[PDB]
C-alpha cells in the first residue's frame, strides 16, 4: 500500500516554499550577532535540578581538494592532524574528536604500522574518535546527482565496516552551499537517525531562530504520512568556526580559540585576543563564556547544547591540541564545580549530542516541529548569494554525469560473472568510484577549486574512465563468446567505447573510424549495451570510412541505416567567421539499435562497392551569403546552398520543428493539425559590478539583466535524413544543434567562451506559456520542487541547480528542459526559462579560493526539449510543493544520462561471436529503475552476494494506458540464488529477509535496496 505521492499535501509545521513566501528577508544590524538580534535569557531557566548539559565537540574540516590537491593536503597538513589525534586522544582519555573525510582516513590508515592501527581501533571502539556520516567526502548537495552521493556515502561506510566495525548514524555538513532534502532522504534509508547542516541563509537562520525551529523533522515534500523523516540539527550563526560556534558574540568567542594567541600566525579580527586561562582569570573567563552558551541555548528547545570546537585544517600541531585541550580542562573543571552556573560541560562527540537531546525529548521536555523544503539559493551575507558554483567550471561538472553512467555500466556489466583476480576487475572498479566519490566533494563538482586542482580531479576522472572502460569491454567479450571458445587475455583491448558525446564533437578527436575496405577489411561488429532495465531501442552512430556501408543484426537482417557527413566547425582566423567544414575520409553512419533490457546487442557493418539497399544519405544545405564549396570525398550527395532563411524540419511523425534565419528554434508544432508554438532560443550575456563585489567562483553577482549576445549574420548547416535531421550555426562562443530524431528534440552546445572576461552566457527559452512567477527545478536528479520567483530578492536569488531538468506549466501546456549536466538556472519572468552555459570571472569572491575563473575550456553541453499538453494530467493541488515529469520527460532525461553504450570490436574476427545478451531479462515498468547492480564478494567466496538498489520515480497520469509490464524480481537475475535480503542503501544492514526469495517492487518516489545470495 504505497503512499500517494500527488494528492496530498503533506501538513508541516514549516514547509519552506511558504516560509520564503512570507519572510521579508531583511539585512539589517543585529548588533553582536550582527544577523540575528541581542539575545536574552532569564537566569533562572537553569537552577539545580534542570542544568545546562554543554558538549564541545572538537573537529577538523579537512577538504579533500580544494587550494591543494588532495595529495598536498595529505602530506602538508592531514596525516599530521590524523597522526596527532591518534597520540592525543590515546594520552588524554577525556578527549574527543570528529572525523568526516574516510577519503584521508584511509590514505592515512592503510600507512600505519600494525602497532598504531590497534590503537587508532581502541580510540574508535571507546567512543574517543568518532566518525560522522563517513562517507568518502562531504559533498556538495546542489550539483551531486543522488546516486553520487549514495556512491560516495556507501564507499566510505563500507571501508569503515570492514576496517573500524563502526557505521556512523549521524551526519555533519557543515560545509555545502547551501542543503538539499536528497540528504535526508538517502541517508534515513541508510540507517541514519540524525543530521547536522549549517550553511543556510542567515535570512532563514534568523527566523528559525526566532521560532526555536533550528531542530526539526526533516521530511521529503511529498511525505505525507512522514516515514523520511530525519531528526536534523541547523547551526545559528555564520561560520562553523569557534568565533561563530560559542555563542552570538564572535568578539567573545574568539577569545575561546587558543590557537589565536600569535604563535600559530593566528590572530582575532575583534581585537581581544584569547589570553591562557589561569586561576586568576577562571571565574571571569567562565562567566563570559557560559553567558555566550546560555545565549545560544535559547534558541533551542533541550537544555542540552552543542558546541562545535574546530575550524580548517585545525588540530594539526601537538603544542595546538595541548593549548585547546589544557584551556577548556581548566574552563570544564570551574563551571562544573560552581553551583550557580548550574551547566555540566565536557568534550563531546556528535552522536552523544543527539542522544542526550533524544533522552530529553523522551522525557517530555521538548517537541519537535516538522519541515519539508530545502535550503538553496544560500547567501551567507548582505545579496551574496552563491549560485555561481551551480555553473562554475562546466566541463567538469558534465564529465561528472559521463563519469556516472559508465561506473554504473562497468559494475552492471561485470556483475554477470565471478571474475579471476587476475582479472583486475574489483581493483578497476573500486579506482573508478573512489575518483568519482571524490569528485562529489563540495569544492570538486562545484568548480570551486584552484586551477592545478580542477586539472588533478580531471586527470584522476580520466583514469577512472579509462577503469571503466577496461572493465565493460572485458565482460562484453564474456558475455557474448562461445563459453567453450572464450580465452581472455585480461590486458588486451577487445573492444574500444565509442562515445558521441564525450568529450565531444569540436572538444578533442577522440572517436575511432571503422576502416572498411575490400584490400583490408570487409565488416566489423559492434554491439550496444543498455544498462536499464527495459527493452530499448535508440538510434547509435559510428565514423566510417566509406559512405557505402550498410548494417545486419546478427541474423543477417538488414537494419535501416543513414549516413551523414562528418562536419566540423573552425572559427576561420581569415575569413573572421565560423563555419563546418565537410570530411572527404570520414563518414557517419546511423541506425536504431534495440537492446534488450540489462542487456546486449550485437550488429554488423559492411561495405559494399555502392550505395546499399537499406542506406539512405541526408541531404546538407549551408545557409550563408557568400558560400563557398564543400567537397565530401565519396559522400553521393551534393551539398546545397543558400542565402540565411527560416526553415522547417520534421523527422518521422514527430513535431514539426521551425527555425529562424539565424538557426535558431521558434517554433513546435506537435501533430499535422496542431498549433505552431513560440519556443524562442536565445543566447545572452550577463556582465560583472564596476564597483562593489565582484562575481567569481561561489558569487553571481550580475550587473543587472542579461544583454542579448551579437549574433552578425551567422552560418547555419542544415542536414535532413529519413532517421535524423539537425540545425547547426556557429554563434560567438556557441555551436548551436537542434537534432531531431522523431520525438522531442536534442539540444548540444559547444561552448567555448575563450577570452570573454567577465562573462557569463545564458541560453533561454521564450514561449507563451502562462506560468507567472512559478518554475520547477530538480534536486539531484531526484524529485522535483516547486519554485516561486520573488521580486522582493535579487536576480541572483531566483537562479537555482539545474542538476537535471526544470520546466515551466500553465493549465494547458508545459516545457521541459532535461539536460546532461548540472548547471545553474531560473525562469525570471512569465513564459521563460533559462540555464548558464559558462562564465569567465576576473576577480576573486572573497571565499578563500584566491582565483577568479579564466581556465575555461571548450564543453559540449547536451539537452532535450519536451514541449507538452498537460491538461489531462492529473497534477499535484495548486498547494502541493512538489512536480513530476511525464513519461516522453523521464524518458528524456534517461537518455541524456544513461544512453546506450556503443563498443567497436578491436580485432578483424570475433571468433564465437554471439547476438545478444539479455533476452530473458523482464522489460520492467518505465517508472522503474535498477540503479546499481554491484557484485559484493570476490571470487574466493562460497556464497556469492549482489547488490542491487532500485528506485521508483512517480509520472503524472495524462491518460495513456501504457500497459503489460513484467514484474522485475532483482533477486532472481542471477541463477541460484540461496537467500534474498532487503538492506539499507549501502548494502551493510540487512532489514528483512525475504519470503520466496522474492524482491518486491518498490513504492512511487521510493529507493530500496536487495542483497541476493547464491550458492552456485
Ligand atoms: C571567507 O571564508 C573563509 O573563512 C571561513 C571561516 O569563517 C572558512 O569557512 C572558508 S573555507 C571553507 O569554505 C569555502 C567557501 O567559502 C569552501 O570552499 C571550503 O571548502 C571550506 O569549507 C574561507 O577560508
Ligand atoms: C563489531 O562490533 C560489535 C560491537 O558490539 C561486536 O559484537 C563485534 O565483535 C565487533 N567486531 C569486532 C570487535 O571484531
Ligand atoms: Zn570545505
Known sequence: ?????????????????????????????????????????????????????????????????????????????????????????????????????????????????????????????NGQLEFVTGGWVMPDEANSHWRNVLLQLTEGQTWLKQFMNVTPTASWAIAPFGHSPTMPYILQKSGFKNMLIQRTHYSVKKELAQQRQLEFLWRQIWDNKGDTALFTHMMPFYSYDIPHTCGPDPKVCCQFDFKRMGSFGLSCPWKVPPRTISDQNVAARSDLLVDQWKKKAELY?????????????????????????????????????????????????????????????????????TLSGDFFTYADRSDNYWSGYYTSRPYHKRMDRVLMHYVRAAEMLSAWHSWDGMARIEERLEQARRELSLFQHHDGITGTAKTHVV????????????????????????????????????????????????????????????????????????????????????????????????????????????????????????????????????????????????????????????????????????????????????????????????????????????????????????????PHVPVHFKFLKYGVRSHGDRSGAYLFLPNGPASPVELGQPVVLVTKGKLESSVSVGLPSVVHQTIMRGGAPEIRNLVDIGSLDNTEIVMRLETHIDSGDIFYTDLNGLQFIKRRRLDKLPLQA??????????????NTRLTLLTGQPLGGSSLASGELEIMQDRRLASDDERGLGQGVLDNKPVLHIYRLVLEKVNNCVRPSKLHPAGYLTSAAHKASQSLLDPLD???????????????????????????????????????????????????????????????????????????????????????????????????????????????????
Open 455 to 674: 586539472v588533478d580531479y580531471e586527470q584522476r576522472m580520466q583514469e577512472a574512465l579509462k577503469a571503466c572502460q577496461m572493465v565493460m569491454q572485458q565482460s562484453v567479450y564474456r558475455l557474448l563468446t562461445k563459453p567453450s571458445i572464450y580465452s581472455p587475455d585480461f590486458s588486451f583491448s577487445y573492444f574500444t567505447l565509442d562515445d558521441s558525446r564525450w568529450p565531444g564533437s569540436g572538444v578533442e578527436d577522440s572517436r575511432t573510424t571503422i576502416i572498411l575496405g575490400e584490400d583490408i577489411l570487409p565488416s566489423k561488429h559492434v554491439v550496444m549495451h543498455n544498462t536499464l532495465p527495459h527493452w530499448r531501442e535508440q538510434l547509435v552512430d559510428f565514423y566510417v570510412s566509406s559512405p557505402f556501408v550498410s548494417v545486419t543484426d546478427l541474423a543477417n537482417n538488414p537494419v535501416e541505416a543513414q549516413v551523414s557527413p562528418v562536419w566540423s566547425w573552425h572559427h576561420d582566423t581569415l575569413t573572421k567567421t565560423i563555419h563546418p567544414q565537410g570530411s572527404t575520409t570520414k563518414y557517419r553512419i546511423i541506425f536504431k539499435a534495440r537492446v534488450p533490457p540489462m542487456g546486449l546487442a550485437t550488429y554488423v557493418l559492411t561495405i559494399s562497392d555502392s550505395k546499399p539497399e537499406h542506406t539512405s544519405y541526408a541531404s546538407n544545405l549551408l545557409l550563408r551569403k557568400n558560400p563557398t564549396s564543400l567537397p565530401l570525398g565519396q559522400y553521393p550527395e551534393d551539398v546545397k546552398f543558400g542565402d540565411p532563411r527560416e526553415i522547417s524540419l520534421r523527422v518521422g511523425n514527430g513535431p514539426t520543428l521551425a527555425f529562424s534565419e539565424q538557426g535558431l528554434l521558434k517554433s513546435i508544432q506537435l501533430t499535422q493539425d496542431s
Open 1 to 125: 500500500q504505497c503512499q500517494d505521492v500527488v494528492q496530498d499535501v503533506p501538513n508541516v509545521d514549516v514547509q519552506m516554499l511558504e516560509l520564503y513566501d512570507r519572510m521579508s528577508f531583511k539585512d539589517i544590524d543585529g548588533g553582536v550577532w550582527k544577523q540575528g538580534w541581542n539575545i536574552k535569557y532569564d537566569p533562572l531557566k537553569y537552577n539545580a535540578h534542570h542544568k545546562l548539559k554543554v558538549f564541545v565537540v572538537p573537529h577538523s574540516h579537512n577538504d579533500p581538494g580544494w587550494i591543494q590537491t588532495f595529495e598536498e593536503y595529505y602530506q602538508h597538513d592531514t596525516k599530521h592532524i590524523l597522526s596527532n589525534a591518534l597520540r592525543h586522544l590515546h594520552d588524554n582519555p577525556e578527549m574527543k574528536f570528529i572525523w568526516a573525510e574516510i577519503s584521508y582516513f584511509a590514505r592515512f590508515y592503510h600507512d600505519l604500522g600494525e602497532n598504531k592501527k590497534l590503537q587508532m581501533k581502541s580510540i574508535v571502539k
Open 798 to 811: 531566483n537562479y537555482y541547480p539545474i542538476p537535471s531538468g526544470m520546466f515551466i506549466e500553465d493549465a
Open 902 to 1016: 556503443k563498443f567497436i570490436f578491436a580485432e578483424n574476427e570475433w571468433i564465437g561471436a554471439q547476438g545478444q545478451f539479455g533476452g530473458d531479462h523482464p522489460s520492467a515498468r518505465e517508472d522503474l529503475d535498477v540503479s546499481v547492480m554491484r557484485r559484493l564478494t570476490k571470487s574466493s567466496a562460497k556464497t556469492q552476494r549482489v547488490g542491487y538498489v532500485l528506485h521508483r520515480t512517480n509520472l503524472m497520469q495524462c491518460g495513456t494506458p501504457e500497459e503489460h509490464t513484467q514484474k522485475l524480481d532483482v533477486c532472481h537475475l542471477l541463477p541460484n540464488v540461496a537467500r534474498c535480503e532487503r538492506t539499507t542503501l549501502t548494502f551493510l544492514q540487512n532489514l528483512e529477509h525475504l519470503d520466496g526469495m522474492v524482491a518486491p517492487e518498490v513504492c512511487p518516489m521510493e529507493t530500496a535496496a536487495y542483497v541476493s545470495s547464491h550458492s552456485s
Open 301 to 369: 528547545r533541550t537544555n542540552v547544547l552543542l558546541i562545535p570546537l574546530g575550524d580548517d585544517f585545525r588540530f594539526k600541531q601537538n603544542t595546538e591540541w595541548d593549548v585547546q585541550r589544557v584551556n577548556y580542562e581548566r574552563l570544564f573543571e570551574h563551571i562544573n564545580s560552581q553551583a550557580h552556573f548550574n551547566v555540566q560541560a565536557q568534550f563531546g562527540t556528535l552522536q552523544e549530542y543527539f542522544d542526550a537531546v533524544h533522552q530529553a525529548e523522551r522525557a517530555g521536555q521538548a517537541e519537535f516541529p
